[model samples]
Each structure stands twice: as C-alpha cells, then as structure tokens.
Target: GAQPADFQAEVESDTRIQLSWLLPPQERIIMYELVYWAAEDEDQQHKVTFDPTSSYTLEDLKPDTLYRFQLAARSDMGVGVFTPTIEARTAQSTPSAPPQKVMCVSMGSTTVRVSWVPPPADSRNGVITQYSVAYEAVDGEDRGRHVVDGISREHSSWDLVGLEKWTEYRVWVRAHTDVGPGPESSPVLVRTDE
Candidate 1:
C-alpha cells in the first residue's frame, strides 16, 4: 500500500516557476512521472519521467502566463490515473503595471482621500484581478494594494485617516484591471498644515 503523492504549483520569479510533489512512499519505487498543461489551453500538455528524489521546475517561461499540472503514479500495481491537476500563474518579468490616473484630495488635518481608474481585460480564460495603491509617510516607501470590478470613477478616493499632523506624506496609486494596471501614477505628497 502507498499514500497519495503531494501535489502543487507556484511562481518562483520573473523568469522561472516550479511544479512539484512529495514522491510516493512505495517500497518498490519502480518508476515515476510528471505531467503539465497551459492554463488557457489544457490541450497543450506534456509529460516526463523523473528521478525518484528530485523535484521539477519549468524555467524561463512567459511572464504572467497561467499553467496547470498533474502527476501519475506507476508501479507493479498498475498505472494510476494522473493525479488531479495543480494550477498556478507565472510571475511577471516586471513589477505590476502602474494605473492610468490617480486623484487624491484632503479632508482634514489627519485625513485624506484616494481613488483611480484601471485598464481593461477580457476574461475568456477566467483569472482573478487586483489593484494596488502605495503611499509614503514623510518620504517613506508608499505601499498598498486593492481591486475592483472594472474601471469606474465611482471608486476613486480612499480615505487616509490618523496621521501625524504637519507631516508630509508621499502617495502613489495604481488600479488593476483584468489584464493588469496600466502604470502607477507619480508619487503625490500631502503635508497637512497644523
């Protein structure tokens, strides 16, 4: 008897990715195999015979491409159906795209507002989307992330509350549509006068 193999996939970096598993615990250990497919086109699939103890990685792939993979077990018992497919998207070669436009306005000494417009995307292959906003406190690294259904002006202006009075804060905003955010807006700094 053998326990099922562990299966999973993930993005490693701008140019690489990995699909891996926990090998079967069978004592005989006669053979092993790995299989994979592209996320959008499962028909574009492949397989490989692998060493018993080593893991597998698909390197130098297209940025932001989606991929799915599965593994099969083979032994004296018989060939088992390919394990369930594991899915993941490759990392982008570059940082998340910047947003199209950003508008921020102040409300009070300790509060401000933020908003943006994102790009467009066609969800033919089914993908999750997200938006990113970044700000710095007194020239600090501005960092934040967000997501919306589409590029609508109604969502502009996120409130920034609770700040050190008479301090300058630099802010950057980016909206992510289905495809990705166009580009981040230039940093905007707000110094609430005391």
Candidate 2:
C-alpha cells in the first residue's frame, strides 16, 4: 500500500470543488478513497470511492465554506496511508435568506425609521457589502414604491424621509453581498403621524 501524492484541491464554485492527485509509480492501486469534512465540524465526515481516477469533482457543497480533505489509495492487500490534509473554501454566492427581525417606527409626521438584523451567517454566503430599503404606500392617494439604496452594512437602521403624513406604508429590507442581493425581508407596516 502506497500513499497518494501531490494531492490538490480547488474550489470550482459556490457548490463544487475539484480535486486531483497522483498515485505512486508502479503501485498496485485498485481504487482510491477520498474523505472530507467541514473545517468547523469534524464529526460529520463524508467519504467517496473512486476507481483509480486521477481527478474527482465534489458537488453540492455549501457555499463560502471551508472544507478539509484527505485521500488514500486502496489495493488488494489493504488501504494505504492517507495523504496530508488539504483545505479549500467554496466560492461566495448570493445570500440564501432575507434580513431578519425587520421593524419600522414612525419618527415623525413625514419620516419613519427602519431597522433589521443581517441574514443568518450560514445564509449570507459572503460578506455583506450594503443594504437596501424599500417602501411603498399601502393605503393613500399615492401608492408609489420607493427604494433607498447604498446603505452601508455597518448600519442596521435607516430613516426614510419625505413620506406623506397620515399614510400607511409597507417597508422591507434586503442585504447585499459581492455576489448579489438576498430576498427582501417581510414587510413591516407603519403609519406616519397625522
């Protein structure tokens, strides 16, 4: 039994990884076994068997996640020693969820303050770069939809001004990453002072 050599791991996309390795020369390699697990959790490991292939592509992996991998060759006699572990992280993707805990408060007759928490860490996919606030009159003479863009991620709250007094509006917040924006949060309804 001989150990696999020159092991390599490459992130192919948000959900895929490409791995390749070389087996020792003149070795009786019948098959290969690949094992991997998320770096954050080592208990839940995944294994795959290959029929002496030099390369394999792992699919359906979590986006923006770090994974550690090891490979070993198997022969008629027994399994060889595993290679040194390698680490790779999947590419970032669009957020999978909307902002959380969205709320709005009427600050005055013509202004409302909106606030929300970022999407869950696992669903963020990448670092949040900015946020978007969307509002539209729910019941009034003007039902136009308006959006406020370019709000920094550092801010969890923003004030929406220029709203009509005595009008009810529905508001939502969405988070954005380098990849793209997530879906907007559930609408929060607020009525400005009369």
Candidate 3:
C-alpha cells in the first residue's frame, strides 16, 4: 500500500498537452506511473499515458471531448496514487468564428490587397491567430488557399498581384488559433471593374 500522487495538466494548445505530477518522496519511489482518460470518458476507464518527461499530443480527437486523469508512484516499498483526477476539454477543432470583414483595395495597376477584421469572440478563445484566405481569380482555374499566421493588428490584408481587369473574383477567409481555427468569414465577391 502507498500514498496518492498529485496530477495537473495544461492544455498548452489544441495539438499539444503538457502534464505534471508530484511523486511521493524519492525514498520510497522507484518510478512514476502516469495515467489519463479522455475527458469524455469515465474515470474508471483509465485514460492514457505518455513519457512523464515529454509532452503529449492529443490528436485525432473530437475537439469537444472532455478528459480526466490520474497518476501513481511505484517503488520497492509501496505504490502512491492520486485520489481524484484533474480534467480539461479540448478546444473546438471546428470553426466557430463570426463573419470576417474583407475588402479588396486596389494597391496598384494589377495588384489588389485583401484585408480583413477578425471577430471578437474569436479573440477571446486563445492566442493571436492566423487566417486562411481562399480566393479565385476570374481568369484562373485554381482556387488559391493561403495561410497567414499572427494577425494581431487590425486591417490586415495580403496583396495579390498579376490579376486581369474586369474579372469577377471571389474571396473567403477563415481564422486559425492555438486552439484551432474558428468559423470562416462571409464570402465576399469583388470584380476588378477598373
């Protein structure tokens, strides 16, 4: 028989999770046993475990999933375990951001700048996020998808050049945070009438 251990976890980001545990004393301890259960599952189910010295990646999981976990110590003297489990849920992997404000401003004779404003709710989730803007030029056959990271400022836009005149161009944008990208912005259609 042995005493219990203490466990805590920080959802460092959507893809990475950091876990820490306090083992009993080095005297009766030989090694540490870390355990975890998906936040959505029951504590009895036994979550999962990884290297205590390393970080854990919770991938291929439902973003809304909740998780609970515990740990114990093992030694020749006895085993010490945590009484209760600490828990946290993964951030929504799906996009939930409100519509973004996008405007196509003429930067030059053939270059148009696409700028946008992110939603407020999107800001409260986590860190300074990037955006994935997709657009198609009237004369082009492919839809261009570009990822822009860290747009903490207002009126942020990318300049796209070498476009034909009098073409109907469609543009759309989606945001990406540490938790994950929220919902996409409203699709805006603009044509180079000049």
Candidate 4:
C-alpha cells in the first residue's frame, strides 16, 4: 500500500468541497479512504471510503468554514499512509438568521437610537460587512418607511432622526455580507418622546 499523491481540495460552494488526487503508482489500490474535519474541531472527524477514483465531492458541510482533509490508499494488504492534510475554506453565503437583541430608545421628540447584536455565530455564514436599519411609522400622521444602509459592521447601533413626535414606530435590523443581506430581525416597536 502506498500513499495517494497530489491531493487537492477546492471550495465548491458554501456547503460543499471538491477533492482530487492521483492514485499511487504500481499499487493495486482496492479502495480509498477520505477523512475530513472542521479546522477548529479536529476531534470530530468524518470518513468516506470509495472504490479507487481520482475525485470525490464532500457535501452537507458548514458554510464559510475551514476544513482539513487527508487521503489514504487501501490495497489488499492494508491501508497506506495518509497524504499530508490539505485545507480549504468554503465560500461565504448570506446569513441564515437575523440580528439579535434588537432594541431602541427614544432620544427626543424627533430622534431615536436603535441597537442590536449580530446574528448567532453559527448562522452568520460569513463575515458581516454591513447592516441595514429600517424604520417605519406604525401609528402616526407620518406613516412612512425609511431605511439606512451602508452602516459599517463595526457599529451595532444607529440613530434615526426627524421622526414624528410621540409617534409609534417599528424598527428592524439585518446583517449583510459580500453575498447580500440576511433576513431582518423581528421588529422592535418604540415611540418618540413627546
């Protein structure tokens, strides 16, 4: 049994990876074993065995994650040495969830401050690059909706000014990555100070 050669891993999508390798020369490889794990959680590994093939695709993996993989050739004798681990990161995807802990406070008769935390880590899917804050008058003479986009990821809160005095408003927040915006958080209702 000899180690597989030229192992390669490539990102196929947010939840899939493509792997390829060259079979060991002069070996009657009966099967190949592929093992992989998230870069952060090596203790939990996943394995797949298949008849000698140059390529395989791993599916149902985490989005925007780093993974490590190794391959070994299996002959009639036994399993051979595994190739050096290869690493690849899946492409980012739009977040699967909305922001968290959204809240707002009236700053004055015509202004309010809205704040929230980023979505849960596992559902974020990718790096948060921006946020969108939308505010709408739910009960007021000024029944209008407005949105503020391009809010940098560093800030978790923003102020909405020129709102109707003492009027009820609904505010929502959603995170964005390079891919696009995610679902908006459950709206938080507040009223401007009289």
Candidate 5:
C-alpha cells in the first residue's frame, strides 16, 4: 500500500471546500480515499473513495465552520495509513435579510437618531458583527449623502448632527458579518425637526 502526499486545502465558499493532493509514489496504488468532518465532533465524519484524482470538492458544510481532512491511498493489497490532518475553515456568508424596522426620530433641532433591529437569526448566516447606517438629504441646499458605519452588534442606532432644520432625508440600514455587508433595509423618510 502507498500513502498520499502533499495535501492542500482551499475554501471554495461559505459551504464548500476544495482539497487536492499528490498521488502516492508507488505505481501499485490504483485508488484513493477521503475523510473529512467538523472539528467539534468526529461522529459527523464522512468518507469517499475514488480512482486517481488530484482533487475533490466537499459540500453542504456550514458557513464559518472549521473542518479537518485526511487522505489515504488504496491498492489491491489494502488501504494505507491516513495522511497527516489538514485543517481549513469555510468563509462567512452575507446576511440573508436586511436589518428590519428602521426608523429615524428627531432628537432636536438639526439632529435625528436612526434605529433598527438586527437581521433575524435565521437570516444571519454568521455572527452579526456590526451594522451600517446611511442617510442622505433628498432636497435643499444642504442635500448630501452620509454614512455611519461599523456600529457594533450590541447597538443599533446612530445620532446624526449638523443637519438643517425642517429638512427631509432618506435613511437605511444593513447588517454585517465577517464575510461582508448584507442587503439594505427598506428606506425610511424623515423630516428633521426645527
């Protein structure tokens, strides 16, 4: 029996990994076997056997998950010892839904406070690390677009200052994770208080 060598791992996406390795040095090796699973539990292990191939794609994994993999050579004689373990983690996924219930309240003259709910648990593919708030004045000499980003997940509000009194503005919010920002919530229209 022979042993596979030079294993490599690639994160294909939030739910997939690509693995490749050099074939064993021996000519008698006619096939190969793959074993992989999440690190939290070995009972979730999976395996596959195939003819000589340099690579394989493992799918149906969770986002932001750490996985371990091993390889072995197969011959008519028997299976060889497993290769040293290789580790990789799936990429984080964007939130499935935008932030919800976005609202802007007038705090006082020339100021408005925007608030929202984080995307629902099911809609958040990974941990919600932060939120983004964007606002813009729709009309008036003060018309301008502005952004208040990287608000920690623990909070979901921002107070905007330096605005003209009685001005109309558009506002929106979106959730963010390690992977990237999600879709924006439906825009809210608010009038700054005098």
Candidate 6:
C-alpha cells in the first residue's frame, strides 16, 4: 500500500466534484478508497472504492455546500496510510430553465389568455419558486411599456387584459427562485381580436 503524495478536487458541476491524487512511483498500491461528506456534518458520510484509479468523481451531492474528502490506498498486505483531507464547495444549482412552450389560448377584443409549461425537472436545477410574464406591444399605441411580473409557480396561465384591439404583441415567460431568474421562454406572437 502507498500514501497519496498529492490530492486535488475541482468543480465538476452544481452537484458534483472531481477528485484526483498522485502516488509516488516507488510505491505499490492495489486499491483506492475515496470517502466524502458534507462539511456541515461528518457523521453522514459516503464512500466508494476504485481499482487503483488516480481519479474519481463525487456525484449527486447537494448544491451550494462545502464538502470534505479523504483518500487511502490499500494493497494485498493491508491498507497502509491515508492522505490529509481536502475540501471543495459545490456550486449553487440554478433554476432548470424558463418555460419551454408558451401559447396563446384565446383572444378577445381587448384581452388574451396565455399559457405555458415549465422545463423538465432535470433541466430545472432547483425548485422553481415562481414565474414571470413579460410582453411587448409590437404594433399598438402602448408598445413595450406595460409588463407583468412575479406570477406564482402554481399558476400556468394568465389572462392578459387591457390590450388593444387587433394589435400585435409578443409574450414570454421565465422561471425564478431566490437565486434569480432563468432564461426566458420562447416568445409567442399574437394579435388581439377585432
């Protein structure tokens, strides 16, 4: 068994960290045990064993938290020595994305009903706290001044009122959380009824 000479970790993603180590060539090692846990509590820990690989990735971890890792090498004789602990903080997970599909469900002389669906769960990095609806008048007297904001996440549709008759407008939506808003959804263009 050999002691790791150098240990390193990198920001793999919002919920993953890449860990690697270097062993002195003069040493012989058969297996590597990688152990890690959230910095907040050491009692809750997890580990994996690799066949003498120089690197391993810790995955499916919680976002925006510090994590500590320790490594040890094992051989046919026994596990010899352990490396000093290393630490890395995972990046915050962002909202998956804005609404994927925005639709104009119905239109009246001075109003329109808009609907949209959120991005897939895997795409949304964290819980969607809410949504926002924005619109610009393309060919109306009150162009681009009127806007809507902060629609609750539970609501998927809204009735846009006070629109001009037979006027063109473009509408879009976004997902948001305490972190901030995600990218805008594809815009939907519509003209109010006559």
By TM-score, the best candidate is 2
Question: Per-residue CA lDDT of candidate 2, range 1-194, in tens?
Answer: 58888999999999999999875688777999999999989999999998988899999999889999999899877898999999999999989899999999999999999999999998999999999999999987888889998999999899999999989999999999999888999899999997
For every model shown, what is its TM-score relative to the native structure? 0.44, 0.90, 0.45, 0.88, 0.66, 0.61
Candidate 6 lDDT by residue in tens digits, 151-192: 888888988998888888888888876677888887898888
* Candidate 1 TM-score to native: 0.44
Candidate 5, 79-192: lDDT as tens digits: 889989999998889997999889899888789899988888767888999998888888888566788888999997888888888888898898999888999998899888
- Which parts of model 6 have CA positions greater than 4 angstroms off? 1-70, 74-91
Whole-model Cα lDDT per candidate? 0.60, 0.92, 0.58, 0.92, 0.86, 0.81
Model 2 worst lDDT window (10 residues):
21-30
- Rank order by TM-score, top first? 2, 4, 5, 6, 3, 1
The sequence of per-residue lDDT tens digits that candidate 1 reaches over residues 1-194 is 14336777778964466766775664555556777667777777777776555367777565567777777766677567777777788654322445456666667787767665553342111232454556567632443332323434345557777755666777776554355554567877677657
TM-score of 2: 0.90
For candidate 6, list the clashing residue pairs, or say none: 96-123, 96-124, 96-125
Number of colliding residue pairs in each model: 10, 0, 15, 0, 0, 3
Report residue 31 deviation for candidate 2 (angstroms). 2.8
Two-way lDDT contest, 5 vs 6, winner? 5
Q: Which residue pairs collide, candidate 2? A: none
Q: Write the residue-wise lDDT of candidate 4 on 1-194 in tens digits.
A: 68888899989999999999986777788999999999989899999999988999999999899999999889988998999999999999999999999999999999999999999999999999999999999986767778999999999899998898889999999999999999999999999997
lDDT of 3 by residue, 66-182 (tens): 666566655676565554777777665544564367787665556667887666653434443566666676565545554444545353777666766766677776676566667
Looking at candidate 1, what is the lDDT of residue 88? 82
Worst lDDT 10-window in candidate 1: 119-128
lDDT of model 3 at position 115? 81
